[PDB]
Design a protein around this nucleic acid. Structure first.
Ligand code: ZN
Length: 595
RNA sequence: GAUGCUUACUUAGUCAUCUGGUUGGCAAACCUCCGCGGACCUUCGGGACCAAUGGAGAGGAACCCAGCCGAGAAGCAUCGAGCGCUCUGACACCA
């Protein structure tokens, strides 16, 4: 499908006043830039507003404007595989004709007809004013703006909507099968119990009301009463991260021997730049400016301080596999997106991987099943379905890196550290509330403490990802096995509930998964995420699937355990790694304990 | 490795008992009401978002800005250790 994983890997450095430049002069310059960023965001938001109305609706006959929409979103498929001009240049030509700001054979007759249909539509007041302003812009700015709007609308609407469609079809089939297999006794009787809840304010799927004793209707409601929710569209809000202004070619002048960057604004003419100092390129960082030239510069604001991003090209490594990672993600996202659809997804993924292998996959498939625990973590290694050895990973960060916590708040990147900042926040927002009441949360209230906590969490995730990548590179792996854990929470997470602010301190296992997947696809590897199956409470040697629930947690609290059935003595992490490595193969099944 | 001076510098990459502490606020910044106009979802109750070459008030608790103290980056200057040279913790960066 779409090439989700590109080869860009952009790097962000903070901007600093140049030593020659005066501090007041630097404040005046960051003011000129803040204005340009605001204008760019406004223009992109307006163009997205104009273009969102041409989408083809689900369950309706196709309108004549659809093929222009698909050309605008994905010119690569629309254009022939070979053409001199880049696809984005063709996108700009189509957009100008559509908005009223094409005979080239690169464009098809259907595309021209659809754009003719599109242009013959009424323009709102916002659209007319936006196009009047956009007329004056340079073709480079117009093209960059159109590309950014297209990528934004694609990523933020179309992916989620297509996933929602595929989810909805399976929801139809599953509800039909459910209604036609066990409960044949509810053709209409559901209405009698539904009406009483309808007349009241019960606008929620999971009925947060305790059982009355229809309870079969209750299980039916929490499952198949309402359709899967449709994704809610938004625009590039300047309050959140939103998008980043792009200074393409001939607009930036970055120097590296000494770190100064020549940014150029839209109004500024040729040969004039705004020089700023920035954090110098790391020496140990593997790529260097000499290796690959910088394609463009991406600017965005955190808090009020500007940051810049350098975009360069880094080639990918060809994987021994004859398939892509996007297909493996596609299976789970679209083909099997449900809870019964997990066993089928895993079987299909295993088949697809095995058939794509050049030689004998069973004899030689270098596999590394990594589990992610709290204090510690270990990864198993498989070559041919035969366990070789388990490796420890150093993931506790203190004055030095260790593999385990040495023997009240633990110094270093720990739950205690994060939770102490969460408590500070819980004790500091109160007085803000009272003072605001006296005068008479927001995403600017504790704007330094939260950004610090976010940087801490992402640093922890980066540590985990790089450690895993290094372990995989040590012994030439081709496949990394990961679970679907949500994440861990710090001690102060629960006492700061009801606020999205507390989400800054969630440990984000998914962030680790994304980083690992990106870095693995970087090096010619594949990542498959099995569905959560609680590997910790499953013995690798014999699949006992322990359920004591009282003694197991105590054993995990000291890092050792003992299987109830036979008596294996391995540490919890090694057991879980072996369990995942087996589960990828056919030797262990998913619980599937829904009924 | 130690020591001293200077800097329109940093204290908003993380950790090492650590967004360092403190004093205040004209401009400015930040903050609160609208709201021309656009728009996504919706159980129609409402939720969420952008926005005028757009207009009105207000806090220095929070946001922002400035001063002071503590500290660290370097350019130079002294001595030293090891072997003139090498000489300042660990990690980590696809935002
Ligand atoms: Zn056992």
């Amino acid at each position: 499908p779409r090439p989700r994983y590109r080869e860009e890997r952009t790097l962000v450095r903070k901007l600093l006043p140049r030593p020659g430049q005066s501090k007041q002069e630097f404040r005046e310059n960051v003011k000129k830039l803040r204005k340009a960023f605001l204008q760019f965001n406004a223009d992109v938001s307006g163009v997205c507003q104009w273009a969102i109305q041409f989408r083809p609706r689900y369950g309706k006959p196709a309108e004549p404007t659809e093929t222009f929409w698909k050309f605008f979103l994905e010119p690569e498929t629309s254009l022939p595989p070979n053409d001199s001009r880049s696809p984005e240049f063709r996108r700009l030509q189509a957009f100008e004709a559509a908005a009223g700001i094409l005979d080239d054979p690169a464009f098809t007759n259907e595309l021209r007809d659809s754009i003719l249909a599109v242009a013959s539509r009424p323009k709102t007041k916002e659209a007319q004013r936006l196009f009047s302003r956009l007329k004056d812009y340079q073709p480079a700015h117009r093209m960059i703006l159109a590309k950014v709007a297209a990528e934004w609308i694609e990523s933020r609407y179309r992916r989620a909507h297509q996933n929602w469609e595929r989810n909805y079809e399976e929801w139809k089939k599953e509800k039909q099968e459910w209604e036609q297999n066990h409960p044949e006794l509810t053709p209409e009787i559901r209405e009698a119990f539904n009406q009483i809840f309808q007349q009241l304010e019960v606008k929620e799927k999971r009925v947060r009301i305790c059982p009355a004793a229809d309870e079969l209707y209750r299980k039916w409601r929490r499952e198949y009463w309402r359709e899967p929710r449709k994704p809610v569209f938004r625009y590039p809000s300047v309050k959140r991260h939103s998008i980043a202004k792009i200074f393409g070619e001939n607009y930036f002048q970055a120097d590296f021997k000494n770190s100064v960057v020549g940014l150029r604004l839209d109004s500024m003419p040729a040969g004039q730049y705004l020089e700023f100092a920035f954090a110098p390129w790391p020496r140990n960082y593997r790529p260097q400016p000499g290796e690959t030239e910088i394609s463009s510069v991406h600017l965005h604001f955190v808090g009020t301080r500007p940051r810049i991003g350098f975009r360069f090209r880094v080639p990918h490594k060809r994987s021994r596999f004859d398939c892509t990672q996007e297909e493996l993600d596609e299976l789970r996202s679209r083909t099997f997106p449900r809870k019964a659809q997990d066993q089928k997804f895993l079987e299909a993924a295993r088949k697809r991987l095995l058939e794509t292998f050049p030689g004998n996959a069973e004899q030689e498939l270098r596999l590394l099943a990594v589990a992610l625990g709290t204090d510690s973590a270990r990864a198993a290694f498989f070559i041919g379905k035969t366990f070789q050895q388990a490796f420890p990973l150093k993931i506790v960060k203190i004055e030095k890196l260790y593999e385990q916590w040495p023997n009240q708040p633990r110094p270093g990147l720990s739950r205690d550290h994060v939770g102490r900042h969460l408590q500070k926040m819980r004790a500091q927002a109160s007085e803000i509330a009272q003072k605001r009441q006296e005068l008479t949360l927001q995403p600017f209230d504790l704007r330094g403490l939260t950004v610090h906590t976010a940087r801490m969490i992402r640093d922890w995730a980066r540590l985990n990802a790089r450690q895993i990548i290094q372990l995989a590179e040590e012994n030439q792996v081709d496949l990394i096995v990961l679970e679907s854990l949500r994440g861990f929470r710090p001690p102060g997470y629960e006492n700061l509930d009801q606020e999205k602010k507390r989400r800054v301190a969630f440990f984000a296992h998914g962030r680790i998964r994304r980083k690992v997947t990106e870095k693995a696809v970087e090096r010619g590897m594949r990542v498959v995420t099995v569905p959560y199956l609680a590997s910790s409470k499953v013995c690798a040697e014999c699949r006992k699937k322990q359920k004591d629930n009282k003694q197991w947690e105590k054993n995990k609290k000291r890092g050792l355990f003992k299987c109830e059935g036979c008596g294996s003595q391995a540490q919890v992490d090694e057991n879980a790694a072996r369990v995942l490595g087996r589960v990828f193969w056919g030797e262990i099944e998913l619980p599937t304990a829904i009924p």
